[PDB]
Amino acid sequence: ASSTAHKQQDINHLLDKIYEDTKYPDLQEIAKNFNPLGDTSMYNDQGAAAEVLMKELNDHRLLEQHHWYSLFNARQREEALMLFAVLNQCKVWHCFRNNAAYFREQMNEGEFVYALYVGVIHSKLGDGIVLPPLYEITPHMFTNSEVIDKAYSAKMTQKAGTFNVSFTGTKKNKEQRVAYFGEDIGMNIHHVTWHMDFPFWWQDSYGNHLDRKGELFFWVHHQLTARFDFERLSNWLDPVDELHWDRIIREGFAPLTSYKYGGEFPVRPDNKHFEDVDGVAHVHDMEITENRIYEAIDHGYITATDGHTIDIRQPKGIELLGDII
Amino acid sequence: ASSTAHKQQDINHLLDKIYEDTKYPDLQEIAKNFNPLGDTSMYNDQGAAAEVLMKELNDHRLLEQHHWYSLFNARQREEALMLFAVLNQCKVWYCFRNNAAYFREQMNEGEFVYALYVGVIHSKLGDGIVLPPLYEITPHMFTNSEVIDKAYSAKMTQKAGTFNVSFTGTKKNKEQRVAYFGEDIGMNIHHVTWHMDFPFWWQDSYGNHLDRKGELFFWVHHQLTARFDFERLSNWLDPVDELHWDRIIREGFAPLTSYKYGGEFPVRPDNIHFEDVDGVAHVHDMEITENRIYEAIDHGYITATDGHTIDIRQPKGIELLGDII
Amino acid sequence: SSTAHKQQNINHLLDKIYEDTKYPDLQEIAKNFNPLGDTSMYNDQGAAAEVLMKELNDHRLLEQHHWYSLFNARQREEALMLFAVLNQCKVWHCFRNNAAYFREQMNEGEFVYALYVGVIHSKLGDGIVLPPLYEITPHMFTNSEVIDKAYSAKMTQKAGTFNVSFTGTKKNKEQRVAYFGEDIGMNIHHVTWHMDFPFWWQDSYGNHLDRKGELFFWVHHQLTARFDFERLSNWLDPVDELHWDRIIREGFAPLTSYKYGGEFPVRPDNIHFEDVDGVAHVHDMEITENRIYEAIDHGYITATDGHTIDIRQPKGIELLGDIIE
Ligand SMILES: *[C@@H]1O[C@H](CO)[C@@H](O)[C@H](O)[C@H]1NC(C)=O
Ligand SMILES: *[C@@H]1O[C@H](CO)[C@@H](O)[C@H](O)[C@H]1NC(C)=O
Ligand SMILES: [Cu+2]
Ligand SMILES: [Cu+2]
Ligand SMILES: [Cu+2]
Ligand SMILES: [Mg+2]
Ligand SMILES: [Mg+2]
Ligand SMILES: [Mg+2]
Numbered sequence: 001a002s003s004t005a006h007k008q009q010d011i012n013h014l015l016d017k018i019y020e021d022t023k024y025p026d027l028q029e030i031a032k033n034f035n036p037l038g039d040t041s042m043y044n045d046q047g048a049a050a051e052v053l054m055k056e057l058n059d060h061r062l063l064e065q066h067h068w069y070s071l072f073n074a075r076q077r078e079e080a081l082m083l084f085a086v087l088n089q090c091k092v093w094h095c096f097r098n099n100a101a102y103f104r105e106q107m108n109e110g111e112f113v114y115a116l117y118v119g120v121i122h123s124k125l126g127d128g129i130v131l132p133p134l135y136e137i138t139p140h141m142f143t144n145s146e147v148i149d150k151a152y153s154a155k156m157t158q159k160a161g162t163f164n165v166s167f168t169g170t171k172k173n174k175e176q177r178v179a180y181f182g183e184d185i186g187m188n189i190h191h192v193t194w195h196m197d198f199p200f201w202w203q204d205s206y207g208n209h210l211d212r213k214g215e216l217f218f219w220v221h222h223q224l225t226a227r228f229d230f231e232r233l234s235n236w237l238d239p240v241d242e243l244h245w246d247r248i249i250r251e252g253f254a255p256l257t258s259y260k261y262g263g264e265f266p267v268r269p270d271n272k273h274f275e276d277v278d279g280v281a282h283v284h285d286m287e288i289t290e291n292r293i294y295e296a297i298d299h300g301y302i303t304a305t306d307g308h309t310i311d312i313r314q315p316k317g318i319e320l321l322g323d324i325i
Numbered sequence: 326a327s328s329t330a331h332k333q334q335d336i337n338h339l340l341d342k343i344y345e346d347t348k349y350p351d352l353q354e355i356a357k358n359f360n361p362l363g364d365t366s367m368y369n370d371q372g373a374a375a376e377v378l379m380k381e382l383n384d385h386r387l388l389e390q391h392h393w394y395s396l397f398n399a400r401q402r403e404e405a406l407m408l409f410a411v412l413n414q415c416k417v418w419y420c421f422r423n424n425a426a427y428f429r430e431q432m433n434e435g436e437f438v439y440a441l442y443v444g445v446i447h448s449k450l451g452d453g454i455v456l457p458p459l460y461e462i463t464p465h466m467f468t469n470s471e472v473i474d475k476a477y478s479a480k481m482t483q484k485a486g487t488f489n490v491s492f493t494g495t496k497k498n499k500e501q502r503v504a505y506f507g508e509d510i511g512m513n514i515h516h517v518t519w520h521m522d523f524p525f526w527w528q529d530s531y532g533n534h535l536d537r538k539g540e541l542f543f544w545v546h547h548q549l550t551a552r553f554d555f556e557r558l559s560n561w562l563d564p565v566d567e568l569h570w571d572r573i574i575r576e577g578f579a580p581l582t583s584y585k586y587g588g589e590f591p592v593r594p595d596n597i598h599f600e601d602v603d604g605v606a607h608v609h610d611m612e613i614t615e616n617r618i619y620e621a622i623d624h625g626y627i628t629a630t631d632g633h634t635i636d637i638r639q640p641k642g643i644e645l646l647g648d649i650i
Numbered sequence: 651s652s653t654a655h656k657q658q659n660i661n662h663l664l665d666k667i668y669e670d671t672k673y674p675d676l677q678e679i680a681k682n683f684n685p686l687g688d689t690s691m692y693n694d695q696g697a698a699a700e701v702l703m704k705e706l707n708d709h710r711l712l713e714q715h716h717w718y719s720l721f722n723a724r725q726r727e728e729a730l731m732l733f734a735v736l737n738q739c740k741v742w743h744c745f746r747n748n749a750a751y752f753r754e755q756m757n758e759g760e761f762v763y764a765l766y767v768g769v770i771h772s773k774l775g776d777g778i779v780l781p782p783l784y785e786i787t788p789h790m791f792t793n794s795e796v797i798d799k800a801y802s803a804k805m806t807q808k809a810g811t812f813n814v815s816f817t818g819t820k821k822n823k824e825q826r827v828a829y830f831g832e833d834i835g836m837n838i839h840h841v842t843w844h845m846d847f848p849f850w851w852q853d854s855y856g857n858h859l860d861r862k863g864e865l866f867f868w869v870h871h872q873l874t875a876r877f878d879f880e881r882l883s884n885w886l887d888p889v890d891e892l893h894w895d896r897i898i899r900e901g902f903a904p905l906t907s908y909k910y911g912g913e914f915p916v917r918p919d920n921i922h923f924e925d926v927d928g929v930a931h932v933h934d935m936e937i938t939e940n941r942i943y944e945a946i947d948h949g950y951i952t953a954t955d956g957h958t959i960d961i962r963q964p965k966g967i968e969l970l971g972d973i974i975e
Binding site: 244246291294299300301309 | 933937952954955956
């Protein structure tokens with residue numbers, strides 16, 4: 001029941017054809033009849049997390065299915081983490097499986113996929129499971145619009161096919177020379193999995209501490225940056241400049257990619273100045289935040305909420321900077 | 326003589342025809358013969374405020390009559406407050422009336438009117454007095470130049486008349502749609518009187534504490550702003566933008582109003598950037614000040630002159646912020 | 651070891667500084683003297699001589715016949731290594747012999763600098779009068795036109811005296827006051843003040859420089875006020891202040907050259923500051939400025955561990971000069 005074979009098959013089934021109601025009769029039956037609140041002894045918190053999520057569901061406060069999802073959207077992230085919190089409290093696999101099946105059919109698919117992945121990664125119940133590659137679970141997030149269009153045409157015409165992916169832009173765009181780095185599907189899996197392993201929303205009340213996370217955050221991104229610059233050097237290009245909030249972003253981008261639901265990803269023109277983003281931040285807020293971080297660095301200490309100093313002139317200083325940055 | 330009738334009559338006479346020497350023979354006699362330094366027992370401060378003001382007067386250091394006055398001008402405010410301080414120390418009405426009559430004939434009329442108003446408001450001797458509306462005491466400050474010119478013409482020709490005021494700007498100026506809000510003479514009296522009741526120069530050594538003043542400062546201006554935006558919404562306009570020191574002030578203004586002495590009020594063009602103001606501040610100084618206030622808010626404490634923390638994560642915090650802002 | 655002999659030694663060492671020494675005694679010393687041969691001549695028993703000799707032997711010192719700038723961190727460090735040796739000499743023969751030895755090994759600009767500050771800050775230098783730098787390194791005080799006539803006079807082996815005119819043209823109103831900043835004595839005053847009160851001074855060199863940070867404020871205040879008096883004398887307005895976010899109105903063409911390194915660069919009129927690679931971003935200057943003003947307006951300087959150093963006291967101005975220079 002909780003053998004590796006059954007848990008793996010359950011996860012495979014839950015992630016199969018994620019944009020449609022489940023086609024597996026056993027999962028259909030669970031989603032119809034299981035009650036996340038029916039027996040709260042299955043949870044290490046006696047049902048607190050399930051109560052939170054069920055109240056949001058019953059009050060019609062959750063993001064609808066067939067809608068874009070972004071982990072950087074505060075409310076959508078909070079909704080995905082409500083499901084993660086339920087899965088994380090499950091004592092045994094049948095709780096994990098049944099809640100996953102129940103909420104798969106109620107919740108936005110992007111939120112669901114995210115919660116199930118981090119639930120598997122951060123629960124002991126997920127030990128031994130191999131998560132399918134996200135580029136086959138949500139291929140729109142890893143595949144350009146031209147190839148997706150060819151897939152839609154194959155499906156409309158009921159014909160199989162294999163379609164070649166090319167890079168975006170043209171040869172006139174020198175940045176295309178290094179598209180094989182940031183568009184590589186495995187490099188993108190590396191990146192999302194690092195953040196799934198070391199999420200910025202992690203709280204140790206979820207079960208365990210993530211050792212040196214803030215320093216690993218610095219290091220993994222330093223390595224992405226240094227590796228990209230090595231590809232630029234390999235292709236007769238100069239190193240990337242750094243962004244600054246008061247200077248133009250020289251290199252624009254046309255993704256030529258689309259969401260499954262939500263439309264095409266937006267383009268950014270060349271040589272644009274940063275503008276304030278309504279509901280996110282003013283450009284000036286970013287500059288102030290940057291200044292405050294540099295104040296801590298140049299002071300040698302981070303300032304606590306009550307004004308006391310937290311020394312960063314020690315080996316953990318870089319980690320604490322990762323935490324606040 | 327201390328009856329409400331006589332005190333009101335005295336105030337009416339002191340404020341009558343304020344740009345000319347007093348036409349009331351009894352006030353003339355007082356102004357000629359009263360000695361503010363002649364009986365220290367008149368005052369709760371043993372005569373100190375009277376000595377301070379008389380020294381400035383005798384040293385010819387006071388602003389001349391028939392000259393513009395601005396409460397925001399440090400030296401002119403200091404002079405007005407020297408007269409306030411005398412009135413505020415008078416024990417009995419005859420001291421208050423006689424000092425007011427004496428200094429009416431010695432001091433700038435704008436300073437005098439200001440000091441007499443705040444003196445009445447903040448002295449128990451002022452209880453029961455109704456201050457005349459400032460739009461009839463200094464009508465230039467509430468009446469556009471065209472109507473003042475018609476009044477001057479009526480006086481030149483010795484012919485009574487009533488003249489219609491009809492809002493600044495043209496119909497091509499969408500901001501004129503809501504001119505009835507900020508140009509309403511009563512709204513302007515509301516605003517000046519709030520600041521007279523709750524002056525930024527108040528010190529409790531003047532006799533009493535002004536409860537929650539800094540928070541009331543936030544609230545009265547929040548309500549002015551919210552009420553203006555309701556007029557904009559009523560007139561098919563969007564809400565006002567906020568000012569930014571580094572961004573253009575979109576909407577200029579032509580007051581089409583004049584001082585009695587000092588000339589026409591200055592116009593501001595549309596779409597101008599802030600410039601440094603000689604003798605006042607650099608634009609960058611405003612940005613630094615803003616940054617320091619936001620530092621206190623985001624720290625949760627104000628920093629005292631010796632560096633210690635003043636907690637604002639409490640109900641009085643908004644009041645302390647009003648004090649420093 | 652008397653003043654006459656010490657003065658002559660210095661005269662000889664500074665003679666024809668761009669060429670190997672022509673004095674047989676100094677050539678013999680440069681050939682045979684070992685700075686490490688008798689450490690009993692140093693107060694540090696040879697520590698400074700060991701540091702400099704290692705740099706020399708590892709071929710890490712700036713070559714001869716190359717421009718030198720005291721503001722270049724590594725070149726300054728090299729000059730100060732020689733200063734450190736001279737400063738450790740107990741007796742004059744150590745000072746003279748090390749000077750002669752390193753004159754032939756080190757860059758001439760570094761050597762002249764080290765020899766001057768060595769004479770000034772060693773008791774062995776008492777009674778010596780340093781030759782004017784405008785005759786030791788005339789390129790740094792003489793426009794390129796006159797140097798060329800000197801070069802021509804030497805190429806043709808004919809004596810001459812050549813008139814120096816001020817830089818610019820009569821169309822350049824700033825030329826009206828060129829006699830101030832271009833005066834060779836005013837230039838010597840300025841270099842010598844900084845030689846007497848160097849920003850690199852550490853009291854481990856042997857003594858404290860009393861009130862240095864306040865004298866730094868004062869000497870430059872007086873240069874600024876004196877320049878403005880010349881502007882007033884020539885129908886010019888006072889100088890504006892620089893700001894990092896505003897154009898530098900007045901450009902400058904020095905029309906002067908290094909002996910080695912080429913012509914001094916020109917600055918066009920009306921330029922915005924640009925970031926300087928290897929030095930600082932313009933934004934870094936603004937942040938540094940802000941931090942200094944934070945200390946001034948707080949009334950205290952913040953120490954490395956966060957504790958406050960009160961500057962509301964007579965030494966505050968000195969501490970400000972310490973942190974501003
Ligand atoms: C002024 O207003 C009154 C009433 O609104 C009107 O009777 C009168 O004609 C007006 N005068 C002019 C000059 O418009
Ligand atoms: C140089 O100046 C001197 C005096 O200042 C003058 O006698 C001489 O004519 C000048 N020489 C030239 C070439 O102008
Ligand atoms: Cu990342
Ligand atoms: Cu107000
Ligand atoms: Cu200097
Ligand atoms: Mg008068
Ligand atoms: Mg200011
Ligand atoms: Mg070079």
